Design a protein around this ligand. Structure first.
Ligand SMILES: C[C@H](O)c1c(Cl)cncc1-c1cnc2c(c1)CCCN2C(N)=O
Lengths: 267, 346
């Protein structure tokens, strides 16, 4: 779906949902009373993976899964993890993102079945109990998500510009599978809230060239871009993989999830 | 939800703007294709607004896509979403727009009725066509098809700061697999009638061609009397009665259309030998050597790959010929078209 493809600079994504890093950290401080900074980024990785798995189960294309992931991040960029259960928010984000597409629909039974099946077969280390939410809960949550996002549903991602850049290099076969995979990994971080997607694409492509020992220095020099901002992104990607190495989500997530601030019940 | 945080929940509920608090709309229904003519309750504007309550409950695929695209689209000739209300109790969705007093269905109907009480101003015709093309060009440049263009969807602003500006509205924002085959034929391009499996930019341009003819004559050019199947025999018969039957050279790929063999079975070239757009338009006092006509003929090209694009149509010498198109299609003149009446029917 190429709807609005060249409109990023006048888009709601750019004008409203590219956030300041210090505004992000300030709002995060309320959840940092319960979880450490390390534990917070580990939770983000966990729910990125949950959303990926839900999307794969439903056979949604990568771009739909990415949009869903961005919805999730935008919600918790503003609000505490206690506000709505992230276990409910994740499938709600996938459901809403799938409805922005007109090529096929995700049914109600299929959404709930997919949430139930993915959590029990792929995430039982984190969830001993069955997915407790029914479809009325998803529909309620959807209204809150749409409201928080100020109805901003069209999300731009690095996949489209990455594809253009590698085709411009003449190195699609060698570099695209790795570069694409690295773009997927950037959703384990805040990068999508902080930088235009084409910059994230350029960084992923740089890391892919370094990993494969491809000299693309002249090609990067031929671009008109702020390479300081690209290097900032590269550092977050390189750090992501060290975090990945040292993180065992399977051993740690049950404990980390138990430290999440819990919803205040009604009086 | 019981597992939602209570404080979070009551804070949002306390702050949430409700449509019924901000706007007076009860008794002010104007259309239902539920559309209301609304005024602000504080009295800080005195402007008129269109409130659309979306059909159904929750957020359907069609509702999602409509909200998604309107939230991004910004152009003087495309209707502009001001605000979305989410009504949590009944799970109803409301869309706020600036109110367009007029539209081409009513404007044309007014001229067609005036002909009986015995033409549409030609500076106005040109200016309308230019703005329709400008708005459609913007949508198309963003890979957004309308998919349902007709006079009822070409709104025209009344008295106010945007006097006589066209506003394209009611885009077909959701079609499953971008397909006409999934659940008036007067503005439908011949490829749709021969079973085209997808909507295209070209399909929109044909519809503009139809609207343009209708503005010039006051009659729907492919008027015809009123299922799942795309093939409509009587509509095709009408197209050929106006246009002539296409020669092989005019539309080489016609043979590839899914309904081509049905066309061959039901129709004979010989039937339409005295038929042409030239002949049709002459009968309605439009000269075939006019720049208006030559552009019209480029819009109403039968083979979609031979149809002019919106951008090329905007460059047509027609728009450089006196009189120049104006930003107010009424050109500062008094507006004779009546306002929309409030409906009181149950
Ligand atoms: C929601 C709609 O697109 C619309 C908008 Cl956003 C803004 N201003 C007016 C309208 C509007 C109202 N009514 C009618 C039309 C248009 C078309 C012609 C039919 N119609 C009636 N009332 O019959």
């Amino acid at each position: 779906d190429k709807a609005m493809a060249g409109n990023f600079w006048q888009s709601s994504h750019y004008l409203q949902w590219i956030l300041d890093k210090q505004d992000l950290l300030k709002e995060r401080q309320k959840d940092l009373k319960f979880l450490s900074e390390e534990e917070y980024w580990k939770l983000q990785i966990f729910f990125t993976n949950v959303i990926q798995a839900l999307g794969e189960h439903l056979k949604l294309r990568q771009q739909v899964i990415a949009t869903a992931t961005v919805y999730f991040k935008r919600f918790y960029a503003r609000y505490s993890l206690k506000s709505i259960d992230p276990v409910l928010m994740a499938p709600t984000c996938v459901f809403l993102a799938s409805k922005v597409e007109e090529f096929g629909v995700v049914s109600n039974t299929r959404l709930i079945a997919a949430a139930t099946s993915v959590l029990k077969t792929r995430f039982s280390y984190a969830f001993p109990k069955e997915f407790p939410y029914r479809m009325n809960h998803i529909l309620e949550c959807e209204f809150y998500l749409l409201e928080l996002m100020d109805c901003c549903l069209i999300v731009y991602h690095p996949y489209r510009p990455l594809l253009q850049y590698v085709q411009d290099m003449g190195q699609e076969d060698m570099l695209l599978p790795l570069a694409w995979r690295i773009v997927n990994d950037t959703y384990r971080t805040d990068l999508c809230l902080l930088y235009p997607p084409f910059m994230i694409a350029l960084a992923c492509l740089h890391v892919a060239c370094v990993v494969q020992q491809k000299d693309a220095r002249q090609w990067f020099a031929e671009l008109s871009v702020d390479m300081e901002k690209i290097l900032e992104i590269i550092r977050v990607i390189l750090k992501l993989y060290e975090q990945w190495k040292n993180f065992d989500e399977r051993k740690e997530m049950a404990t980390i999830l138990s430290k999440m601030p819990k919803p205040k019940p009604p009086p | 939800d019981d597992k939602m945080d209570y404080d979070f929940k009551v804070k949002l509920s306390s702050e949430r703007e409700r449509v019924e608090d901000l706007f007076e709309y009860e008794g002010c229904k104007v259309g239902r294709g539920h559309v209301y003519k609304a005024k602000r309750k504080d009295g800080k504007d005195d402007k008129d607004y269109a409130l659309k309550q979306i059909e159904g409950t929750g957020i359907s695929m069609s509702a999602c896509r409509e909200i998604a695209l309107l939230r991004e689209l910004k152009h003087p000739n495309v209707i502009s979403l001001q605000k979305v209300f989410l009504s949590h109790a009944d799970r109803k969705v409301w869309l706020l727009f600036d109110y367009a007093e007029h539209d081409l269905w009513h404007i044309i109907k007014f001229h067609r009725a005036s002909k009986a009480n015995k033409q549409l101003p030609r500076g106005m015709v040109k200016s309308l066509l230019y703005q329709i093309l400008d708005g459609i060009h913007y949508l198309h440049a963003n890979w957004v098809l309308h998919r349902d263009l007709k006079p009822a969807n070409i709104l025209v602003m009344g008295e106010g700061p945007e006097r006589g500006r066209v506003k394209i509205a009611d885009m077909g924002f959701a079609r499953l697999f971008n397909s006409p085959l999934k659940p008036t034929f007067w503005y439908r391009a011949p490829e749709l009638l021969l079973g085209a499996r997808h909507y295209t930019k070209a399909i929109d341009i044909w519809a503009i061609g139809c609207i343009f003819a209708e503005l010039l004559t006051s009659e729907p050019i492919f008027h015809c009397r009123q299922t799942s199947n795309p093939y409509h025999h009587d509509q095709l018969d009408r197209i050929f009665n106006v246009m002539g039957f296409p020669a092989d050279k005019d539309w080489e790929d016609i043979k590839k259309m899914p309904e081509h063999s049905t066309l061959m079975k039901d129709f004979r070239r010989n039937t339409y030998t005295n038929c042409s757009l030239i002949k049709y338009m002459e009968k309605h006092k439009v000269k075939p050597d006019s720049k208006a006509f030559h552009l019209l003929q480029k819009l109403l090209t039968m083979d979609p790959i031979k149809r002019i694009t919106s951008e090329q149509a905007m460059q047509d010498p027609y728009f450089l010929e006196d009189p120049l198109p104006t930003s107010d299609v009424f050109a500062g003149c008094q507006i004779p078209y009546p306002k929309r009446e409030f409906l009181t029917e149950e």
